[model samples]
Target: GTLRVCAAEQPPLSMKDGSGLENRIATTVAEAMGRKAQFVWLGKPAIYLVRDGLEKKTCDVVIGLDADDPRVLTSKPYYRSGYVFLTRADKDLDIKSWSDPRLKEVSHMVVGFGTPGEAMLKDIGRYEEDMAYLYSLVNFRAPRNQYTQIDPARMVSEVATGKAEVGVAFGPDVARYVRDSSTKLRMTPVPDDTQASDGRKMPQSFDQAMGVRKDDTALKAEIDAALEKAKPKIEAILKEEGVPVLPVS
Candidate 1:
């Protein structure tokens, strides 16, 4: 049987250009299993898509998913990634981690109101970053509030062009931007985790893995074997996709 795959369609994760992390991962799995691979895209959240797509006869496997997700059986986590900072290459950004003194030196473009970066800023009451909190939920509104937002693409553009001095965003968003943009922007992983204003620990990183139908025990086992052998290439592919990778090993 073929490795029929499902994915939420988007850049760096899954796309028509075939640059998505999961797309590459699916290809690896397919090759290792000695089976043809297929792709079926989704516009829905992964939680529902796992069942919804399968029930719709769209696919049998899902890639680029959280390992802890119980909606479907997941393979051993292959990668872990999270948020970081972006700044112009020419600039001297000393904010190595979230807990740097240099962070207060300049204004920052935050990805969203509740992102871990925002939480870290909130922990120390970096409300100045609040005025420039960028949004990913909208495209046409003024940068006034959560109702008015900018996507990760714009987040990179603004920082790179000096429209913003710095940007706080997920690692993939920054990495993808770094790869796609002509201007060289530096990506610094958020380090030195701290408690947020709300007492929530700023999320430093999370693991990523492939998901498959729970009843497909044989398929899951096969994918696991493939992952073990393909781990080295998988790491390289993730780096190429601009996703910061924390290997399981």
Candidate 2:
């Protein structure tokens, strides 16, 4: 049998070349479960995978979902990671906190549309000045009524090329690009306790898992065991892709 893996066109996670973290992980986990990995590609953003893919039965699994995602039954978490600050290594800026004073002085910062990084930028009073530059990265496509994001590679490249002083993205999302950039880049993990402007903590870390239909108890159990058996291999994959993993909390 095949493991019909739900996938979107998201980069560094799900790409057209079949070279993404979740793609490889799903293949490995499926192998451990004695099944072939057959990808089910959807043009919609990955946020719709559980609803449009798994619920429709077009796919049986979706990898790299937050373990706490409520739409589906999540398998055991494979890894934990968090958002990071991307800076040109040549600049020697070792910023690791949202409270850093240097954040306010940076000329431009690139961040995802609705992520913690964007909210943190607003908290630090840099959002207004950086708004136009951020929009330009997406070619001025408004995110209205849809999911839009500055691709991870472009985010890293903006910092690497000095077009932006810094870029904020999830570690796994940008790690490979950072690793492969001709211009050296540094990724510093954002602290877990980062607070928003209202003093509420912004979520930065996530436990990544596979998702199945809510009633797929049998499949969930099988995949959980497969994930366990594939643990070492998964760690190797993460390392190979240059992902920085945090201990599960």
Candidate 3:
């Protein structure tokens, strides 16, 4: 049997080098399954390719997905990830959580246009409306600035230099940036509020898994078994790659 796989271009998670731990793990798993791994590279969010694979029956497995994302039939999480806010250390935005009252007062909050962060904002259905009610109290805008219209690394630079008051990005990205700065930026955890416009709980970690067609149970089972068999090796690879592994609970 042959296996087709998909991966998005998310750095540290998936990349072009074919040297990322996730890619290596996928290759190892494919070898274990006695199938040749055919990788299909997609844009930032690999969910699109997952959908395509399911729609066209083109692939047997899709990797680098959040375990809790309702969009796919996910397997046990193999890792965990969290979202963090990055901001200048010198400026006190007084932001403790996503629902902080002071967030609206900040000049701008930049986020990737089509990324999980944007989806999270949409999940907080009423936060923007509520913020509008206190118009005199805050000066925030709706649909927050879509930094996806620009370069993400540049957005990070803007936040680091105080060009933007706050920026939303993945935790690893924040860690990478703060590591090099003398006056490091602070990473703030979003608050737990399911009702706000961007109030969804940040996933503790995105347990990377395989996304198969909804009806492809046999294929799903085969992939799952392969993952189980490769657990020890995958964990070792993830550790070497700086990705934290979480036991499926």
Best by TM-score: 2
Candidate 3 clash figure, as a count:
7
Better of 1 and 3 by lDDT: 1
Better of 2 and 3 by TM-score: 2
Model 2: per-residue Cα lDDT over 13-117, one tens digit each? 888887887778878888899989898878898887777787786887777777777756777877888888777766667887778788788777888887777
Ranking by lDDT: 2, 1, 3
Task: Please say which candidate is ahead in lDDT: 2 or 3.
Answer: 2
What lDDT is reached at residue 163 by model 2? Answer: 85
- Tens digit of per-residue lDDT, candidate 1, span 77-162: 87788777777776666467655666676655555655565555656767654553443334436554323334568777777677
Question: Could you tell me every candidate's TM-score relative to the true structure?
Answer: 0.80, 0.94, 0.64
Which should have the higher TM-score, number 1 or number 2? 2
**Worst lDDT window (10 residues) for model 1?**
140-149
- Where does model 2 exceed 4 Å of error? none
Model 2 steric clash pairs: none
Best by lDDT: 2
Alpha-carbon local distance difference test for all models: 0.69, 0.80, 0.61
TM-score for predicted model 3 compared with the true structure: 0.64
